[PDB]
From a paper:
The protein [name], secreted by [name], interacts with the V-[name] to inhibit acidification of the phagolysosome in the early stages of infection. V-ATPases pump protons across a phospholipid membrane using energy from the hydrolysis of adenosine triphosphate (ATP) to adenosine diphosphate (ADP) and inorganic phosphate. Successful pathogens can subvert host defenses by secreting effectors that target V-ATPases to inhibit lysosomal acidification or lysosomal fusion with other cell compartments. This study reveals the structure of the V-[name]:[name] complex, an assembly formed from the interaction of host and pathogen proteins involved in the infection of phagocytic white blood cells by [name]. Removal of the C-terminal residues 415–573 of [name] did not significantly affect V-[name] inhibition by the [name] mutants, but truncations of the N-terminal region of the protein has been demonstrated to prevent V-[name] inhibition. These data show that binding of the N-terminal domain of [name] to the V-[name] is responsible for its partial yet specific inhibition of V-[name] activity.
One [name] construct, consisting of residues 16–278 ([name]-N), yielded two crystal forms that diffracted X-rays to 2.3 to 2.4 Å resolution and the structure of [name]-N was determined from these crystals. The second crystal form of [name](16–278) contained two molecules in the asymmetric unit related by a non-crystallographic two-fold symmetry. In this crystal form [name]-N exists as a dimer, with the two molecules swapping their second and third α-helical bundles (red arrowheads and oval). This domain swapping is accomplished by a rotation of ~180° relative to the first α-helical bundle that occurs through conformational changes within the short linker connecting the first and second α-helical bundles (residues 117–125). The domain swapping retains the interface between the first and second α-helical bundles seen in the first crystal form and the domain-swapped monomer is similar to the monomer in the first crystal form. The monomeric [name] predominates in solution, even at high concentrations, and therefore the elongated monomer structure is expected to be the functional state of the protein. The flexibility between the first and second α-helical bundles is consistent with the flexibility in the linker between these bundles observed by X-ray crystallography.
Numbering used by the authors:
A (entry chain B), B (entry chain A): 16 to 273
The structure:
């Protein structure tokens, strides 16, 4: 979708740039650098097929890495195109490629990549339908935005870097993996320092939808009426907390013995 | 798009960024860094007044520098805009600005600036009207394209740096200062090693046009019809050579001796 379509676009664009840079297939060093990507554009796959390969992790699907590696070939294509009709010798092209490589890699790092990754999260949520994944993602992103407002992105912050890791992973995760989504979000809430991490950060209406979501997930998995009675009452809270989640986890433990 | 017109465009875009980042004029250090820009753009000047200031040097008119300085504020605006509705303390904003400034300054340097300047000349020459200025510029850019194909732009080459400097200077030169255009091109041809620096590079069709350009320039300056006929005798050459310009100069010297 919004993410894996850009992955396929970057894969097709890298191959287009490589072919125009090296129209006679002689820049073996550069093509070996990109063969992990180029193979998916040379194997007669359709757009839908590469899309499913990106969702299943069969092809390169790190959009930020693909974007950085596309910029390298784009820079080299600009040079090759701007000196037309004059050809450059093959080893000189590779010499230019190595310098552009380290130059672009430095630019595509530090605060800049974090800034791009935040945009990936907000753009993905721009018109996202209210799903558990999208509710988890919008809650995590709002915490991320609040922490960046307090700490910035030019220095390293472990809590922010964890939100980027888990958030982007949830973003690229398949929409049908309900268990993996619930596991990721419950993992983040437990593995973060604050007790009520969403207080003052999300509207009160959204905080209740989060509580109702976690309740409706474990509700059909109670192998006893008595265990499913108290869990239904835990919806009396309107803020997702670590105590509320541990309360749900304890009910699954008492039901696991039965 | 004319050079100085692009200068005004970036001057305006910098002011709109600053107004969105700091609407109440509290980031004193950032506005101090951009004071040479904002003193023109934060007032109600007409476009033509800023344009005349750029063409006369009264306001910053380095298009690559202005592009670099604009990217810093573009990145800083992205951060402030991407964390909304959460806001950042003013000290943190200026702290993020300093690190973004150093990061962008690394990106907007080295081969990348030269690539932008080469792309700037080739963009301008795309379907450009065959005027003396554009013919002079296309002749120098073609020599620049050839030398780059031979040496690249990732390593420093002094001959290439002079073609950029002279090429961009002629690119920004007013289309009406025709005697200044001729003098620049005449000076490049004389201050370069090759006797005929355009053969093997520029097409023979354009070399003949380049010769006829130098003849149509010095013909009105001829007062006596005897010298006017001596200049047309030089038109039998299809190669612009150092000797052809020395001959046209000697014919122009004896005309002033009357």
């Amino acid at each position: 979708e919004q993410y894996h379509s850009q992955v396929v676009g970057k894969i097709g664009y890298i191959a287009r740039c490589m072919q125009t840079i090296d129209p006679e297939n002689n820049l073996k060093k550069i093509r070996e650098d990109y063969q992990d990507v180029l193979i998916w554009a040379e194997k007669n796959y359709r757009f839908e097929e590469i899309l499913e390969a990106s969702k299943s992790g069969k092809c390169p699907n790190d959009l930020d890495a693909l974007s950085r590696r596309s910029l390298i070939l784009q820079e080299l294509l600009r040079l090759v195109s701007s000196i037309s009709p004059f050809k450059m010798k093959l080893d000189l092209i590779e010499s230019q490629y190595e310098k552009m490589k380290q130059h672009v890699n430095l630019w595509k790092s530090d605060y800049h990549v974090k800034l791009n990754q935040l945009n990936q999260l907000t753009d993905y949520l721009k018109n996202a339908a209210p799903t558990p994944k999208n509710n988890f993602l919008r809650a995590m992103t709002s915490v991320l935005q609040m922490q960046i407002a307090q700490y910035g992105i030019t220095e390293d912050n472990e809590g922010i870097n964890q939100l980027f890791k888990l958030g982007l992973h949830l973003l690229a995760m398949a929409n049908e993996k309900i268990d993996e989504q619930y596991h990721l979000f419950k993992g983040y809430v437990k593995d973060q320092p604050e007790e009520s991490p969403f207080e003052g950060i999300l509207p009160a209406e959204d905080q209740k939808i989060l509580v109702k979501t976690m309740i409706d997930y474990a509700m059909p998995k109670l192998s006893s009426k008595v265990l499913q009675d108290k869990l239904s009452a835990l919806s009396s809270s309107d803020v997702l907390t670590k105590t509320l989640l541990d309360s749900i986890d304890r009910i699954v433990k008492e039901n696991e013995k039965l």
